[PDB]
Design a protein around this ligand. Structure first.
Ligand SMILES: *[C@@H]1O[C@H](CO[C@@H]2O[C@@H](C)[C@@H](O)[C@@H](O)[C@@H]2O)[C@@H](O)[C@H](O)[C@H]1NC(C)=O
Ligand SMILES: *[C@@H]1O[C@H](CO)[C@@H](O)[C@H](O)[C@H]1NC(C)=O
Ligand SMILES: *[C@@H]1O[C@H](CO)[C@@H](O)[C@H](O)[C@H]1NC(C)=O
Ligand SMILES: *[C@@H]1O[C@H](CO)[C@@H](O)[C@H](O)[C@H]1NC(C)=O
Length: 539
């Protein structure tokens, strides 16, 4: 609510754009996470760029985000715009999922148009297109067109025409109290409904027009991992808004067909006789389906959906899972201990032939849950919550890669998978303290030089020592200056060390995460992380 920005933004393929977002310049908000993210299925919003150093590969070289804590604003710059950039976005503070954000529309045309808003909506759901007009057209014909074949085709008229493909699921809502707009409400959106729409009031040269870019999204499959002859539970959570529409669970085919495993109209596929359970539905309209005695053949894409006949159809809301059924092989989870405020360096083995495959590190949640939600991969992705504290390195290589997680707490205790295209790791948090020693709340000042200490015990004297800035593609090493020993340790004086990171002329882009760390050839170890902030006056 408190966040402001441009609600409509229009551009041309090739140009560039500068979106400015305003926020309350509270103490917290000054260096809190700024994010620019794109709206996706099911309310999701995918980080495209953040103030923590994360930059989507889709924005690599193409975009930047500059904070202005004095103004109370930050500015997202995007260049080399493509039509692919047309969409709905949020600019915000904190984490994408939380509230503090503002909703931005971005449209990109091929050459030079008009007032254009983007709508982004899930399959099967409703959209409301608002169509504004001037008083001189308030009692003339209201229309909605769709560009079908570079031809505007009438979808609905105030004269009573409704296009055959929309009948029964479209209405033209005339506002009361003399407001100067009408709305078109479209239900049960289909993939085919996506496209370019034209709102029109009047039929004159005096006509009032608005462009609407309607996007209709398929859902993202949730991944589920289960063992042969084990069970799985699908929690189907469509709206309360469809709680009274018949539900189905079905399995996707090589074809476009999606054959029903279970129904609320009596269908229960023979393959699943005696091992399928359709549980009752919530007051939320959500329900679950349980499958036992899994066969390898049971693995695939599953949709649960709502449609009056109990079958998958166009314009039906849906939810997706990808199921994996794997053999029970012959092993216990390798265990790694770390201590709060410090770090781990977990070695993940992969099969040497799968060397250029993608590696994954994810949090495993137990066989019934079935899900192992990703935290980081080898392609520059990182979960938002883990920006500045998590990386996946290809070193040492040749059958092994490293996951570095730091800024530890008790919360991080749990089971993790190393994945490729496998290895379970239990992280335990024990009483102890970090060997490396770093300041917490560090603040440089614009144009001035800053230097930042890191203390290394004697333990690490023959280790290689580094400073680097953290981004999501990799921690980049910096000029550090080896300085004299340090007295911050016990049973240590001469062998210990202090290594300093020096930032000679601080720019606004020097803000973000810096890691102090330790290394032995290609085998990485402990790290310590410090956030460098940037203001401009002095203190
Ligand atoms: C926000 O500030 C940006 C950078 O500037 C600071 O404030 C202005 C008023 C000047 O004194 C400048 O020298 C300072 O470093 C500007 O580039 C931007 O236009 C400003 N915009 C808003 C809305 O505050
Ligand atoms: C924003 O990106 C452009 C390239 O499109 C780059 O030249 C510019 O320096 C960037 N902004 C900042 C503040 O570095
Ligand atoms: C349904 O409408 C679309 C345009 O939205 C059109 O292209 C398509 O051919 C129509 N299909 C049928 C079966 O009428
Ligand atoms: C991120 O790391 C890459 C090296 O992989 C480097 O080229 C790039 O400049 C870094 N990004 C920033 C914003 O420093």
């Amino acid at each position: 609510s408190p966040i402001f920005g441009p609600e409509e933004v229009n551009s041309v393929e090739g140009n560039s754009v500068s979106i400015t977002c305003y926020y309350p310049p509270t103490s917290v908000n000054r260096h809190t996470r700024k994010y620019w993210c794109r709206q996706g299925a099911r309310g999701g919003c995918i980080t495209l760029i953040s103030s923590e150093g994360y930059v989507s590969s889709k924005y690599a070289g193409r975009a930047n985000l500059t904070n202005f804590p004095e103004n109370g604003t930050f500015v997202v710059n995007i260049a080399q715009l493509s039509q692919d950039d047309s969409g709905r976005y949020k600019c915000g503070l904190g984490i994408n999922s939380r509230g503090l954000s503002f909703d931005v529309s971005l449209e990109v045309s091929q050459g030079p148009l008009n007032d254009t808003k983007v709508y982004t909506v899930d399959l099967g759901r409703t959209v409301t297109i608002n169509c504004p007009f001037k008083t001189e057209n308030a009692q003339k014909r209201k229309s909605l067109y769709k560009q079908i074949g570079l031809y505007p085709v009438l979808v609905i008229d105030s004269s009573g025409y409704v296009n055959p493909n929309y009948t029964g699921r479209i209405r033209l809502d005339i506002q009361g109290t003399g407001q100067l707009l009408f709305s078109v409400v479209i239900n049960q959106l289909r993939l085919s409904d996506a496209g370019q729409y034209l709102c029109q009031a009047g039929d004159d040269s005096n006509s009032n027009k608005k462009n609407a870019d309607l996007q209709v999204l398929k859902p993202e499959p949730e991944l589920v991992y289960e063992d042969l002859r084990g069970s799985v539970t699908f929690h189907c959570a469509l709206g309360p808004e469809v709680a009274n529409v018949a539900k189905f669970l079905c399995r996707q085919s090589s074809g476009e067909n999606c054959d029903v495993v279970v129904n609320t109209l009596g269908k229960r596929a023979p393959a699943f006789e005696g091992r399928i359970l359709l549980n009752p539905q919530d007051k939320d309209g959500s329900f679950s389906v349980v499958i036992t005695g899994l066969r390898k053949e049971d693995a695939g894409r599953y949709l649960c959906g709502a449609h009056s006949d109990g079958q998958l159809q166009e314009g039906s809301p849906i939810q997706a899972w990808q199921l994996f059924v794997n053999e029970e092989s012959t092993r216990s989870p390798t265990v790694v201990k770390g201590v709060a405020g410090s770090s781990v360096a977990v070695l993940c083995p992969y099969n040497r032939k799968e060397s250029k495959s993608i590696k994954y590190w994810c949090l495993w949640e137990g066989a019934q849950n079935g899900r192992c939600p990703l935290l980081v991969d080898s392609e520059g992705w990182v979960k938002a919550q883990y920006e500045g504290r998590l990386s996946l390195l290809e070193e040492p290589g040749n059958g092994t890669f490293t996951v570095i997680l730091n800024q530890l707490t008790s919360r991080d205790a749990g089971f993790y998978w190393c994945l490729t295209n496998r290895t379970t790791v239990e992280i335990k948090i024990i009483e102890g303290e970090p060997n490396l020693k770093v300041p917490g709340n560090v603040t440089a000042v614009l144009g001035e030089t800053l230097k930042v200490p890191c203390h290394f015990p004697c333990k690490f004297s023959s280790y290689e020592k580094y400073w680097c800035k953290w981004n999501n593609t990799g921690c980049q090493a910096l000029p550090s200056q080896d300085e004299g020993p340090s007295k911050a340790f016990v049973n240590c004086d001469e062998n210990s060390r202090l290594v300093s990171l020096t930032l000679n002329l601080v720019t606004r882009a020097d803000e973000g995460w810096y890691w102090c760390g330790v290394k032995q050839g290609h085998f990485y170890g402990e790290t310590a992380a410090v956030y460098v902030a940037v203001e401009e006056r002095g203190s």
